[model samples]
Target chain A: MQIFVKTLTGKTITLEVEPSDTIENVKAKIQDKEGIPPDQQRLIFAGKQLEDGRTLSDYNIQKESTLHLVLRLRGG
Target chain B: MQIFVKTLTGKTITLEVEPSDTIENVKAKIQDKEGIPPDQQRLIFAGKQLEDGRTLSDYNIQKESTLHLVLRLRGG
Candidate 1:
């Protein structure tokens, strides 16, 4: 199924992930698209992480789900 | 003399703007510390839009400045 994603630079990109993919798998995809390290990924939905080991189905994510993948950056 | 602000959830806030401040006077002090307006001030540095009516010593912008006020949210 298709999923819509947004980057920290306010750029929107779309991806297609299989039903078997986990949130961690999604993070890897995001890293590929944005060059953001998986360690630096802070995927937020409704103001929190997707929760450990939880599949997108656990969050009711459907086809064309718009995920806001904000890559963490260090400043001061 | 001090302006290191961030939002969009990552949340690191600091400000000390004086000495005749402008960038529309720091976008009305980041719309009063995070109401964030002045038309979604996209004050990006090392990228773009620090032009037009140039001050901050013609883009020198000293005195502990670190403003990255990006507040524009609309989705498709």
Candidate 2:
């Protein structure tokens, strides 16, 4: 299955991974691809966190689904 | 006197306009600059709308403030 990941910069990256991958695994993949540290990033799925070890298959995420991978930048 | 306008595509366009310009005016400028139809667009400043016809001066917007010019899209 494919998932679309977007950044605050508005750039999108599409990934084709096994549906069995957990959200944490997706986070790691994003960090690997973007060079963003995992600790400094947060993934927002449909405006909410992908907490727990939920996989895309568990959520039944389909193709063309978009997820926001936000780099947690602090300060005003 | 400058405000940064960003698109969902991650492109940024910086504009220099009078601080007295209202959010509606900014919407017009963005429409002109990006060719995004006004009816389909929504301007979000600091994550909220500048309702009540308030101008940038009224809100005391800083020089480098960034405003998101979201071209709202609907569909599955």
Candidate 3:
């Protein structure tokens, strides 16, 4: 499966992720790609937040789902 | 394939759609369910607006994509 993470900067990047991957893992991948810390990130989709303890399948995020990535802190 | 369309009212509806389905088709379904006409809607996903002449696959929306619906009319 794949997913797109769109940032407030208007730049969107796609990630080839897995349904069994935990949300925390997804955060780490984002951190590695964008140099943002895991705890400082929030992945939101369908008006809901992706929980750290849950996997992508928990949110039915199979296939090419697009999620919004917002910082935990206020945007600059 | 499928997708979710959310409205400003905070209510979202799911459509069992196809990749070959045009954006216009999706709008008609939303109209059928919410009494909103196609001309009045703008289905946005991942910070991009869906085009009526374009098919879902054109936007890489082959899965359970979640798109937001905001009407063209000024908010009440």
Best candidate, lDDT: 3
Q: Clashing residue pairs, candidate 1?
A: none
Candidate 3 lDDT tens digits, B1-76 = 7678775448888888877888899898878877787887766665545668888887778776777766544221
Q: Candidate 2, which segments miss by more than 4 Å at Cα? A: A1-76, B74-76
Which of candidates 2 and 3 is the stronger one according to TM-score?
Answer: 3
lDDT of 2 by residue, A8-72 (tens): 55778777767788777877887788776776554555434455367776666667788765554
lDDT by residue (B1-76, candidate 1, tens digit) is: 8767654456656767765566666776767977767665545443234432444545677787664544444310
**Window of ten residues with lowest summed lDDT in model 2 chain B:** B67-76
Better DockQ candidate (2, 3)? 2
Q: Which lDDT value does model 1 have at A28?
A: 79
**Local accuracy of candidate 2 as per-residue lDDT tens digits, B16-72:** 868788766777776788776665554555434454366777666768887655443
In model 1, what is the error at residue B44, expressed in angstroms? 15
The CA lDDT at B7 in model 3 is 56
**Against the true structure, candidate 2 has what lDDT?**
0.64
